[PDB]
C-alpha cells in the first residue's frame, strides 16, 4: 500500500520507551547518615583578643566552622544550636587552612548574653 508521508529529507532516531531503574536491591543497603551535621559545621569559637573585641562591639559572633560548610549551613546551624537569628555570615579560610565565620545576629538578640551562655567570655 501507500507509504507514510515524510516531508523531510532526513530520518532521525525514533523515540523509544525508556524504563526506569529499581533493579533488585539497594546500592548500599544502608543510606548514609548526615555527613555534615549541625554539630560538625561548627567546631568551636574563637576567643582571641581581636575576636572578643568584636563580640561586645558589633553584635557579632566569631566561630570556627568546618571547611566543607557554606553560608546557608552556618546560618541554619546557628539557629538550631543557639535559638538565635543570623543577619549575615562572613567566611574566610584562615592561613592555617581553617574556616572562620563572622555571624551577626539581628537586633533582637545581643551576642554578649549569648557568648557567656555558651561558656566563653
Amino acid at each position: 500500500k501507500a507509504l507514510k508521508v515524510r516531508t523531510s529529507a532526513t530520518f532521525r532516531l525514533p523515540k523509544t520507551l525508556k524504563l526506569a531503574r529499581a533493579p533488585k536491591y539497594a546500592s548500599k543497603a544502608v543510606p548514609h547518615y548526615n555527613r555534615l551535621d549541625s554539630y560538625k559545621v561548627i567546631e568551636q569559637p574563637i576567643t582571641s583578643e581581636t575576636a572578643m573585641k568584636k563580640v561586645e562591639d558589633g553584635n557579632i559572633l566569631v566561630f570556627q566552622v568546618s571547611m566543607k560548610a557554606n553560608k546557608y549551613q552556618i546560618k541554619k546551624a546557628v539557629k538550631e544550636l543557639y535559638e538565635v537569628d543570623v543577619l549575615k555570615v562572613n567566611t574566610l579560610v584562615r592561613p592555617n587552612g581553617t574556616k572562620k565565620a563572622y555571624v551577626r545576629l539581628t537586633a533582637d538578640y545581643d551576642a554578649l548574653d549569648i557568648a557567656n551562655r555558651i561558656g566563653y567570655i
Binding site: 508521508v5 515524510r6 516531508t7 529529507a9 530520518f11
Partner: protein, 233 residues
C-alpha cells in the same frame, strides 16, 4: 461568502516558498537500510550462477494455501499436549503394562536440514517444502539437487516465518512428510504431481539458466532510447 477571497499562490521557481511534499525518494536512510537495499540491487546486476536461479521461482499463490492446508493438519505436537500424553503414557504403563505402545503413530511434519538430508538419502521423503529466504544460501543449494537425483519432489516455497509456524518455530528452512494418514493420499498424490511440473520436471532446464542482470530504471530507459533511436532507418 464575500469575505473569503481567492489567493491561489504561484509555486514556481522564483516565488511562493515551496509547499511541503513527500521527499521519500530524498531521504538518506541509515547505513543498515542502504546496505540491505543495495544487497539485492547488487545481486541482480550480477550474473548469478546457474545452480542458483532455481530459487526466485516459487509455488504460486493458488497452490500455496492448498499445499499448506495439508501440512497444517499434521502439525507437530505442542508442549502442552506432550505433557498430557506422557502422564497418560506413564499411567498406561502402571496398570496396562504396555511396552510404551499406548499411543498410536505420530503424524507430524518433518524438518531439520540434518534430518531431511538423511531422509532424502534414505528415500524416506515424498514431498519437500523449501524456503527460498536462507541468508546463507549454501544450506539449500544442494536440496533441489538431492531431491532430483534421489527422485524426491520438492517445492521451494516462500517464507521461513511461514514454514516456522507450521513447525511452531520461527524458521525451519525445510519441511516434509514421509508417511501420511490413509485419508490424505488422494490430496497428496495430485499435490505432488503439481510441483513436479514446476520444480522437478523443469529442473533440467534451470540447470543452465542465469539470472539477475537487470538494470535500473534510469539505465533500462537509456537502452530503450538508444535502441529505438538506432532503430530508425
Amino acid at each position: 461568502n464575500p469575505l473569503t477571497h481567492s489567493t491561489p499562490k504561484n509555486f514556481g521557481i522564483g516565488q511562493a516558498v515551496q509547499p511541503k511534499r513527500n521527499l521519500s525518494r530524498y531521504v538518506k536512510w541509515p547505513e543498515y537500510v542502504r546496505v540491505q537495499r543495495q544487497k539485492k540491487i547488487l545481486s541482480i546486476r550480477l550474473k548469478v550462477p546457474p545452480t542458483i536461479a532455481q530459487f526466485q521461482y516459487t509455488l504460486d499463490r493458488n497452490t500455496a494455501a492448498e499445499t499448506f492446508k495439508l501440512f497444517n493438519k499434521y502439525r507437530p505436537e505442542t508442549a502442552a499436549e506432550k505433557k498430557e500424553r506422557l502422564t497418560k503414557e506413564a499411567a498406561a504403563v502402571a496398570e496396562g503394562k504396555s511396552k510404551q505402545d499406548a499411543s498410536p503413530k505420530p503424524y507430524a511434519v518433518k524438518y531439520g536440514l540434518n534430518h531431511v538430508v538423511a531422509l532424502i538419502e534414505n528415500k524416506k521423503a515424498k514431498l519437500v517444502l523449501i524456503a527460498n529466504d536462507v541468508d546463507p544460501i549454501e544450506l539449500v543449494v544442494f536440496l533441489p539437487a538431492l531431491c532430483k537425483k534421489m527422485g524426491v519432489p520438492y517445492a521451494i516455497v516462500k517464507g521461513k516465518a511461514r514454514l516456522g509456524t507450521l513447525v511452531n518455530q520461527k524458521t525451519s528452512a525445510v519441511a516434509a512428510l514421509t508417511e501420511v494418514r490413509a485419508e490424505d493420499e488422494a490430496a497428496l498424490a495430485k499435490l505432488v504431481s503439481t510441483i513436479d511440473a514446476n520444480f522437478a520436471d523443469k529442473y533440467d532446464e534451470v540447470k543452465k539458466h542465469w539470472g539477475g542482470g537487470i538494470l535500473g530504471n534510469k539505465a533500462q530507459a537509456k537502452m530503450d532510447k538508444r535502441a529505438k533511436n538506432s532503430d530508425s532507418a
